[PDB]
């Protein structure tokens, strides 16, 4: 009707993401004091021109809502500089991660561990992952001794680096367009409840308008190529609707797997399970099928050398 894509002998209609689908960037800052007290607390060096890349995307995509999901202990002057950025660029909306409610996606760690202890103990002795069982029982024991109410959100809230960025990235994309409405962003043009979202890594340069994308069941992700290898990546995630069943599958894996990774399980696991890229299927074929491709998305050049 408007396109079709094939993977593992199943046809998937290309669903449109209209030119109003918001863009999303993420900046979670551990050390905001490294920036001036009156500076936008986003990295903007010639090695990492992230603030420039966000602005350049907002300049190109005039009609489209541009989200910047931020977190960290920003000074009063750094929040005013972020407030001023939303004024210089009408389509830029700064969303503080602390202003969103993720409790509907949460689960208690004690519930996950008990489920898995019961699942593993039902198995016969000749198939039981005896190392994993001991580790889970150990993880449960530390929860009951230190923080018996610890959940996926509270535990991920304490982690450092990418694992906490990746965790909230998945949950924001499950909210989709609703997240801008929940955060009380005014003047979001054509932004609909139940609407999708397009996450972009800040090291990527938009050089032209995306227009309308056509993606298999309304989802696609970045596929990175390094040397002669390719890999599913979370550097780009495009969904045409809130609560996309492939990301919902990724969350269900987080709710059942004892040490679920937001990237490996929440995105790669969710996608693979959803489209039946089983272990007996061609990973390379799935990458070509699910890959987000657009002529106006440019890979970071600053990385490169001889």
Numbering used by the authors: 26 to 331
Question: Anything the authors wrote about it?
Answer:
The long-wavelength beamline I23 at Diamond Light Source overcomes these limitations and extends the accessible wavelength range to λ = 5.9 Å. In this study, we report the determination of diverse protein structures by experimental phasing techniques carried out at long wavelengths on beamline I23 at Diamond Light Source using S, Ca, K, Cl, V, I, Cd, and P as anomalous scatterers. Native-SAD uses light atoms naturally occurring in proteins or bound to proteins. We demonstrate that long-wavelength native-SAD has become a very compelling technique, where a low multiplicity dataset from a single crystal can be sufficient for successful structure determination, making it a general vehicle of choice for experimental phasing.
Using this protocol, we selected 10 projects solved by S-SAD phasing at the beamline, including soluble and membrane proteins. Structures varied in size with molecular weights ranging from 14 to 114 kDa, sulfur contents varied between 0.9 and 6.5%, and diffraction resolution from 1.8 (detector limited) to 3.4 Å. The overall multiplicity for these datasets was below 26, which is four times lower than the multiplicity typically needed for S-SAD at shorter wavelengths (100)10.
